Nucleic acid binder design. Sequence first.
RNA 1: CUUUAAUGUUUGAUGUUCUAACGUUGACCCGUAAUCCGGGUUGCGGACAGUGUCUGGUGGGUAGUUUGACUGGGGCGGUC
RNA 2: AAUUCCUUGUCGGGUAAGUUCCGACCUGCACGAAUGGCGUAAUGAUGGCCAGGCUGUCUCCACCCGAGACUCAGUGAAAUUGAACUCGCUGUGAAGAUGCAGUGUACCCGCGGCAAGACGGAAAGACCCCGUGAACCUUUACUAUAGCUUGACACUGAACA
RNA 3: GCUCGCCGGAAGACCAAGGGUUCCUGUCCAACGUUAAUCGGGGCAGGGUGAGUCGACCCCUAAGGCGAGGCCGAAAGGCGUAGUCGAUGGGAAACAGGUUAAUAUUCCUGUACUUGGUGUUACUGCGAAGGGGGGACGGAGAAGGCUAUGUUGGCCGGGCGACGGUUGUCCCGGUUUAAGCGUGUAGGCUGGUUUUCCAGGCAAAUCCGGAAAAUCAAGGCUGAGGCGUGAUGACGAGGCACUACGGUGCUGAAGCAACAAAUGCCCUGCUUCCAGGAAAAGCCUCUAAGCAUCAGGUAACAUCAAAUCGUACCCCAAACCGACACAGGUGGUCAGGUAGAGAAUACCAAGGCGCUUGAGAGAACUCGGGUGAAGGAACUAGGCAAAAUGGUGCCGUAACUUCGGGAGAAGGCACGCUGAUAUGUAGGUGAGGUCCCUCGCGGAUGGAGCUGAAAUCAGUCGAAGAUACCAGCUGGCUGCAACUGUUUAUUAAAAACACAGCACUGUGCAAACACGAAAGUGGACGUAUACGGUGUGACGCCUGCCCGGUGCCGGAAGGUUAAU
RNA 4: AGGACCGAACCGACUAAUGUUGAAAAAUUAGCGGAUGACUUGUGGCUGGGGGUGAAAGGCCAAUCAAACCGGGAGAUAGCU
RNA 5: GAGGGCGCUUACCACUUUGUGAUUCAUGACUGGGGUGAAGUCGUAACAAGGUAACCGUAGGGGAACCUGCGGUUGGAUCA
RNA 6: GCGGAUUUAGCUCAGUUGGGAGAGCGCCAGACUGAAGAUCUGGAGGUCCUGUGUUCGAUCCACAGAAUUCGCACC
Lengths: 46, 267
Amino acid sequence: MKRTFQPSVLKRNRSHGFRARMATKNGRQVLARRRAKGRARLTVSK
Amino acid sequence: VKCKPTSPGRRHVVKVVNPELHKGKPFAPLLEKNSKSGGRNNNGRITTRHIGGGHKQAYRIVDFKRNKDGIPAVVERLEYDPNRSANIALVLYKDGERRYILAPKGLKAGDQIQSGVDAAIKPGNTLPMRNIPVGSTVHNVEMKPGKGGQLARSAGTYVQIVARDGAYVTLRLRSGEMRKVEADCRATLGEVGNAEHMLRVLGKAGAARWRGVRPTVRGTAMNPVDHPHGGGEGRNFGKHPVTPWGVQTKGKKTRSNKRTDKFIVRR
RNA sequence: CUUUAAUGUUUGAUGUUCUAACGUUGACCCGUAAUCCGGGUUGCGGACAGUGUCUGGUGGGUAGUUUGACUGGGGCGGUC
RNA sequence: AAUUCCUUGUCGGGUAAGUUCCGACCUGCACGAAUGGCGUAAUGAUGGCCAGGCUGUCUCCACCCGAGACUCAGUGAAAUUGAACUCGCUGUGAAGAUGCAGUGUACCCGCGGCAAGACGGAAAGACCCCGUGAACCUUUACUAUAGCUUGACACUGAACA
RNA sequence: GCUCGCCGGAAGACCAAGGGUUCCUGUCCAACGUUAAUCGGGGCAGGGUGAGUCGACCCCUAAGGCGAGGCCGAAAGGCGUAGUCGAUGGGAAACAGGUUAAUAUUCCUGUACUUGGUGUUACUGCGAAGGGGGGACGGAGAAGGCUAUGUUGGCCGGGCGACGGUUGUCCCGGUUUAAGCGUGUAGGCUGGUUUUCCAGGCAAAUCCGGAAAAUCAAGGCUGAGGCGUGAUGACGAGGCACUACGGUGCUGAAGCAACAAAUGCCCUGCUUCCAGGAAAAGCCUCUAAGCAUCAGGUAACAUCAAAUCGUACCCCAAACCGACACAGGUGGUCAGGUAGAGAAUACCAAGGCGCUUGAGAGAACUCGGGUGAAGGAACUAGGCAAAAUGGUGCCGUAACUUCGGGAGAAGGCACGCUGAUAUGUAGGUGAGGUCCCUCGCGGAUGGAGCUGAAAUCAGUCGAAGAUACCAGCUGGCUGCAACUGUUUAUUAAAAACACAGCACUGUGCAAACACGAAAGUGGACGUAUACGGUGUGACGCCUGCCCGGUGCCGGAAGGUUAAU
RNA sequence: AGGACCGAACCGACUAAUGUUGAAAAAUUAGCGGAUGACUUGUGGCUGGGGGUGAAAGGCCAAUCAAACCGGGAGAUAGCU
RNA sequence: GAGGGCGCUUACCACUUUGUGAUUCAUGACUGGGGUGAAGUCGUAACAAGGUAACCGUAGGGGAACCUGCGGUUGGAUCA
RNA sequence: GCGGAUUUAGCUCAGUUGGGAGAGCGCCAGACUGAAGAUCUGGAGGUCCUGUGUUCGAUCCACAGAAUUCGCACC
C-alpha cells in the first residue's frame, strides 16, 4: 500500500551495498561492466 | 474439586464464572533467581509445529535436580506456575541457601523438610526409594537414575511403589506398569498439590492460552492445500486419514535404547 | 547296509544369555570462574542401532497427461 | 427443511381481500444421536415486511440561493481511428437500405436539444471448439516419487540347553 | 488603514527518515507559477547554522552477526564454545540573563563538574578476572501536597475616559525572583548497638544467608516543595535625543497577597490484579594473589587534556512519497482558552498568512429539499431519501428466571428571566485576634477573605424556553453461532464458525514431529491429568441402538505361495 | 470485577450517495463503533522460487501473481488467418 | 368598606390507555389417557408347583403378559 | 424404438441337459384333541402365454405375435 521510491542508508546491507556488489560474484561482473570496462562512474557512495 | 480449600465459581453478573477464584498464591517481585524462553518456533527454517503465535513465552522457575537431600530446610511461602499448573514452594535450607521445591496440597508450618540415606523419611527434597516404605505417593522419580525428575508438577499423577518387585525394579503407573526403573531412583512425595487448577477448565478462552501462544483450532477443516481432503461444496464426507503417518490405533515404536515396556495391555 | 540308538569324527541352526563391540542426548571425575567441546572411572541398555534394495499395499501429502472420430454442437445409444 | 413425490391440499376462523396477521383432523419419496439433538443469555458491524408515528413514496411537483455546462476572458492534452458532400419504415436479398430508386424533396451554421442510428466504446466476448494442447485444485477410478511399515540378507560372535 | 477569514489535534516548537545548505535579504524571469505574476524551497549575488556537557564511541546486550580447535565437507557451504561486534537497554551530564538576518543547552556572562593525567599540603592499610546486596522493569490506580497558569483587587503608571453616560468606588497595564546551597517536610522503608559462631556463598572473606549471646529502646538512608540565600543582580510605566527609521544612545516606575484546576512534579513511594515485566554496569562493599619503612584511595584547593561528527532549511507531514502546490499515509515532541461528559461541535490570539481561474448571466440538463390543501405508505428490489425520538427525575411499566438481566422498558414533562427565606440558604474554605508546647517546616482556640447547591412560597411572558451545535423507534416476530466480534481485504459482511470440555489415540520415554547435508533448537528446563489426533459446537442433559456391507486395526489356531 | 453496556485520533472495511471520461487498482460528507485489549502500532536484521507465516487464504504476496517486476535456455513448439 | 356573581390558580375527578394478563365461551386443522368387552384378531403370565411360579418400592430389555436377580415378614405342596 | 425380465400350485417363487414337473406354506385325510391348529405321516394342488420350428423328447431355446414390466433413447 505505502508505495514506494524512497531514499535511506541502513536498508542497503542485503540489496544495494557496494562492498556486497564486490563480495558477491553475482554483483562483481556488473560492477566492472558498469564502470571499469563500462567507460563510466557511480560516485553515489554516501 | 469436592476438596478444600476449593474456591467455587461466581453468581452470574459477569461474562465469567471461571477463572479460578484462588486468593493467596500470586506474588511479586520475580525474585533474584529467575529465567526466560525466547523467539518463536525458529527451528531452522520451515517449522513443523503449526499455528505458533509466539509472543510472551515467557519466564520459568529455575531449580532442576534439587539434589541437596541431607541438609535440613523450612517453607517460606507457596506460589503457582503458568507453564505446568504447578504448586511450588520457596524453601530456606538451614545451612544458608534459598531454593524452589515442588509441593503437595498445603505443605507449611514451616515443617521439617529433610532427606538422607536411611537417616530420614519425611516429604524430603529428593530421597531414594530403596531406603524408605511403600505407598501410592512418591512424586519426583528420576526419569532414569541420575538424569532429572519425571514429574515437575503435583497435578495428581500417582506413580505407586511395588515392594520387592523382581529385585528393586518397581512402580505401577497409568500407561506402562512395566517401567522396571530401579528403586535406586529418587522420590520426594506427593502427587496432589493443586488439582483445582487442572481438574476444571479456567476459561473458554483465558490468559493461560491467548496472551503469548495460539493452541491448534484446525488441521482437516478449510483450504485443501494442507490435508488429504478435498474438492469444495462444504461437503467433506470421504475417507481422509492423517497421512503418511496415521491416527486411530496402530502404534509407532519397534526399537530404541532402554525400551522397557514388555507386556503392554494398552486398552 | 537301513528304518535307528549309544559315542567318536565331520558340522548347520534356534532358543538360552554375558558382553573389551556399541551408543553414551546418564552420572561422577575432569582440561575449565566453560552453553560448544577433549578424555577416563563408572553406569546403562545391548549385536539392539544404521540404512542399501527385494516382497507387500497405503493414500490423492510433488509431478504429470487430458489420448481418436462420427458432432441436422456435445453427455448417453450406433459404427473403421 | 433446499423431501413439501402427489396440486399454491387442508376445516374455514379472522379479514375493504388470507398464494397468510397463522388460527394444530396432516396426503410424511431421498428425518436425526457428534455432518447430533428437545431448547435458550442479555448484545445486533440487523436479515424480512408488519402497526402507529412524522409524511408528499404512487399519481400531482408547476415557485425558489442556488454547483455549473452551452456563454466571456488564461489553457486545451488522448481510452485512436471508415473517404461524407453520411435519405426519415422504405423496397431486394453473398437472407439487415444513412449509397442495387417506388416515392416527399431536408438552404449555410449552432455540437445548443442530442431521444434508435461508428451496434459503439473500458477489452484477445463469458457461452469456447479443429486444439498431437500452459498446468489447475481431486477420489475405496489410474497411480507415482518422497514416504509408512514390519520380516530379510548384507553386517556384529557361540557357549550351553 | 479598514471590516472580516483558513489551518483550531495550527502548514505553533526542535530535530532524528539524508534527501542535503534552493531559508532572512540584495534582487529576478526561464530552465518556470495551465490567471495576473510583485509571489512559488522556484534562483540567483552574499554569506552561513558557534556544542567539554545535546546525543552514538566507551565499560556495555536480549534477540541476532561472525568465530579459534572442530563434527563435517564433491567444488560449494552448514552449525557453534571462548571471544567480539552490539540500543530502539543503561550510567555521569544546562539554566537565568543577553545578540547576531540568521543559527542558538553552544555565542557570551557567570554559576560552578564530570571523566582522566599532574602539584602543594593533609588523612588513611590497599586490592579482582571470583562473593553478596539489588542493578529491574509491566499498567490501571489510590491518597496528600506544589501550584503551572489564570482571575482579582490592596499597590503602582495613566486619567476620567471622541456618540448617550460618565470627575472615590471606574478600568485599564506590569504582578518577574533565575542559580546551588541549605535539609528534610508530605507519605514511606527499618526498633538501635556490640560480641560469639556455622552441615552455607566458584580457593577465600570485616560482605551476604543462617544462628547464639550481650547491652541499649527514641536510633538510620531523603523527598515535590513551601521557606529562604543571592540581589545597591536587575527588568521596566515613563522622561530627553539621535537615526542608516532596524533601532541605540542617555536615563527610569512599580514590585502584595488570595483563590482554583493539569496534560506535570513527588510516588523504582503505596495499593491492586496476573499473561508471569531480559543481561553486563554505575550505587554500596567483601576478600584471592601480591605489595607490604613500599604502594593504593579520598580531600582542600591549584591546572591541563577536554579525540574525526553533526548542528541549515522540513512534519500527527508540497524539495519523503504520492509523482498534475494531489479527497493514500501518518509520528516521538511545550499542550493555547471560558461555560462542555468530549481529541463530541458552528466561535478563538498567534505562526505560516486568506492558499495566482472569476467576471457577469439566471431556459429544461437533478451532486436536491420543505413547508404542502387531500389522504397516510394506497411507492416499490431498498418508511430508500427528510428525520423524530436523544436529560437527571417522576405524578410510575408487559411477556419471561439463565432470579444478573429482559429495565436511561415504555410514557410525556415543569424547564426562559428572577423576588423572598437569603444586603444569599446549606455545604466547601480557615485569615487573623487570643492561648499552649516540645522550642520550630508544632499544636489549641477562633470566622477574616473567597465560593456556591438544592428547593419552598410567589410571579407571568410564548407561535415558541432541556428557546442553539453532542446524542436512540416500546415493538412483537425466525433458525439460538450461545462468550464482544471483524475473521476469508476481491461477490457474501456472516445466515462463516475460533470456543472448550472427552471417551479414544502417538510417546514408559535419546518422547511424537526432522524443516538444515552434520544440529537436538519447538515440545523442554519438560511425562502418557505435560504436548499433539481428526473434530467438538453455550449450559445441561443425552447419545437410544442395530454388525449385513465397508472401514479401523489387531492376531495366529491355519491355507493361498516370497526376497529367505 | 468483566475479550463491561455507552466513550478519540493507535481499527478496518456493509449499501450506497457526488467513487468509473479515476483526486482513485482505491478513497470518500453532515454519519458511525470494537472502549484497553481474541487490540493494531511504527527504525532493522531469520523465511530469497515454484515459495512459506497458517483465525486457515486460492485472496495474499507491487499494486492485475494458479509464479509474477528475471533476462541468460530460445529469434521455443509452430496442424497459426 | 365585604362578598357573591367571576377570573385567575390548581386538584378530588368523567371521558381516555402505555398496556397487557385473571378467566368464560365454540372455530377445537401431528393426537392418545382411564373403559364397555354383539360374536373382534396376534399373543395368554400370574388367583394349586395356572403343571423348568414368583407378589414389594422398582432400575431395564423393549410384542410385557415386564420377564428376572438380591432382602424378607411363609397370604406358594412336603420327609426335598 | 432396442435390449432384458415375466405370464410355473391359495401364498413366496425355486427349477429347466430339452424324456420326471417342484418344496417353505395352505387345504384334505390319517389320528392325538369333543374340535381345531401346533407337530405329525400319508396324499394332493398346474392356462408351466399362444403360435411355428429345431428335436428322439420344447415348460424351457430359436423365431413371429400378444401382454404385464424396467433401464436407456426425448432435453
